């Protein structure tokens, strides 16, 4: 759901709803790569 | 009054945020290296 | 104070105003990259 600040998730496990903002959130990568070397190509790069 | 300093915190949250939009920036500058090497 | 909430928001309308910049000329490449294929 796109409303406000926040965005209403749903759980790739459980799919249940889970309400969070949209300026606190942390997104991934696509599949073409995996198990790097060194993190200098997270062309994405996040803690997570 | 004050709180709004807060929301001033928020906004500086939303600044790192920016950062992150820099680094994206980064990311697209790296990408127009990419085709000049191509 | 007071007055740098303005300043605040014009730099954040610039940023995503530069935000849709990057999103085309990204899509530009993506074309780009294509025709290199």
Redo the contacts between chains.
């Keep these: 759901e796109e409303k406000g600040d926040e965005v209403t998730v749903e759980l790739q496990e459980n799919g249940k709803k889970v309400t969070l903002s949209k300026?606190?959130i942390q997104k991934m990568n696509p599949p073409k790569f995996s198990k790097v070397e060194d993190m200098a190509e997270l062309?994405?790069?996040?803690e997570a | 009054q004050q709180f709004?300093?807060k929301a001033?915190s928020?906004?500086k949250?939303?600044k790192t945020?920016?950062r992150?939009?820099q680094?994206?920036?980064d990311?697209?500058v790296?990408?127009?290296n990419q085709?000049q090497l191509?």
Aim: proline residues 0%.
């Design positions: 300026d606190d062309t994405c790069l996040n | 709004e300093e001033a928020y906004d949250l939303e945020k920016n992150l939009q680094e994206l920036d990311l697209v790296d990408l127009d085709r191509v």
